[PDB]
Structures are given as C-alpha cells and as structure tokens.
C-alpha cells in the first residue's frame, strides 16, 4: 500500500500442474523417449526392465520379481503421503 505491489506469475498453479501432469504421463507411457523426440509407447514393466539394465541389473531380475518390485514401489509412495501429512520441516526450503 506504500507504493509496494506483488505482480502475478505468468503461469498459474493450474498451468504448472498441467505441465507436471504431462511430464508424468510422458514418463509412465513412453519412458525417456519423449525427452529426445516423439513419445514412443512402451509397456511399463518393459520400461522398468530397461531401467534395471541401466543400473547393471539383468532384466529377468525385474520380470521374475515384478509383483514384489511393484509392491515395494506402491508402499514407498504411501510413505510420501505419511511423511508429508505428518512432518513440519521437509518444505522448510520453500517456506524460507
């Protein structure tokens, strides 16, 4: 009010969520291919097998353990809700 103003950002939080949504959908439908060219579909377990090769693990180690690997991923995403809903100091870097 003392000659001081806040200008709005160009992108809305809705538009940031739409970009973020496109980045998720690209990665889960097409792996890294949308990062370099057109999005090429690949099955998701088939993409996780390429990720296991990328860390020197043989892709049969994914396919033979696929349900366990999916459960460990699903359980670890549950811990993100539990952590963020419980904590007060993770987002301290943004609140600062």
């Amino acid at each position: 009010f003392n000659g001081l103003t806040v200008l709005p950002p160009l992108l809305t939080d809705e538009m940031i969520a739409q970009y973020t949504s496109a980045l998720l959908a690209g990665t889960i439908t097409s792996g890294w291919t949308f990062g370099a060219g057109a999005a090429l579909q690949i099955p998701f377990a088939m993409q996780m097998a390429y990720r296991f090769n990328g860390i020197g693990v043989t892709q049969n180690v994914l396919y033979e353990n696929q349900k366990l690997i999916a459960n460990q991923f699903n359980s670890a995403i549950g811990k993100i809700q539990d952590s963020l809903s419980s904590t007060a100091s993770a987002l301290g870097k943004l609140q600062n």
Partner: protein
C-alpha cells in the same frame, strides 16, 4: 528512505541469484532425472537411480 530502498533492492538482487542457481539445478534435474535415467551418483536420490 532512499538508503532503505537501495538496501532492499540489493538484498533482492543477491537473493534472486540464489533462486536462479536453484532453478537451474531444478531444470537440470527435470532433464536428467525425469526425462532420462542419470548415472551421476547422488544427483537423483540415493541408491542407483
């Protein structure tokens, strides 16, 4: 008042350079961690990314 305002704008420029450095790192993690699989150790979390 001018001294106060020069001080504010100088803190803001120094603070904006920290946010630019942070956003450059974020944009690089968007390319290398979300749009790729990084082999760079501890760039995309702990363990093999």
């Amino acid at each position: 008042r001018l001294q106060s305002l020069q001080t504010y704008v100088t803190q803001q420029l120094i603070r904006a350079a920290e946010i630019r450095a942070s956003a450059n790192l974020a944009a690089t993690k968007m390319s290398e961690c979300v749009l790729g699989q990084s082999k760079r150790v501890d760039f995309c979390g702990k363990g093999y990314h």
